[PDB]
Amino acid sequence: TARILYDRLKDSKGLYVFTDPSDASLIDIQELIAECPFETENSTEWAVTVLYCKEEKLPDSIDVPEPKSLTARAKELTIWQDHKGRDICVMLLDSPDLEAVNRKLVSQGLPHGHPEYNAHLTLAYQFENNAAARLFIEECNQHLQNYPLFLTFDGLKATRM
Numbered sequence: 001t002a003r004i005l006y007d008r009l010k011d012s013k014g015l016y017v018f019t020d021p022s023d024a025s026l027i028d029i030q031e032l033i034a035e036c037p038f039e040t041e042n043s044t045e046w047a048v049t050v051l052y053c054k055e056e057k058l059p060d061s062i063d064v065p066e067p068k069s070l071t072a073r074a075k076e077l078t079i080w081q082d083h084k085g086r087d088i089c090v091m092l093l094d095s096p097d098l099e100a101v102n103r104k105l106v107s108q109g110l111p112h113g114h115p116e117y118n119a120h121l122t123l124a125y126q127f128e129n130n131a132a133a134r135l136f137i138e139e140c141n142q143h144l145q146n147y148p149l150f151l152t153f154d155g156l157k158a159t160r161m
């Protein structure tokens, strides 16, 4: 039932909206990555960005989404690179729910910080892609295909920045 408290934030410079995995989904993610050979963000850090908005003049009002359930399918793990070209392990999410929330925010004058919204959950921000890590990612993606994993998120949480 966590929700975007827009009017408390309407006068901020920028808007960050994220959602947190449910208790059950936290346990599901932990069991998914049980055999991971590299260190990962801990369970308190796992969050899914829904809006990264650097607009300094936010709209005065909006139609706030307030979805009733937030679901996503854990599609796969893949490797991204950060500013300094360091490897990042992220969990790609297939989520019509989160796409819809992001679209609802962007269409009302809240621009997202990337040309397309890519729902994902970052699992490791600094990551040595070695044979063990690659085997882990491969087996996890095969597991994600053989056993569909759906995640649920509890609310929408908004902060400045």
Ligand SMILES: C[As](C)(=O)[O-]
Binding pocket: 020, 021, 043, 044, 045, 046, 047
């Ligand atoms: C990523 As959190 C808001 O569950 O500490």
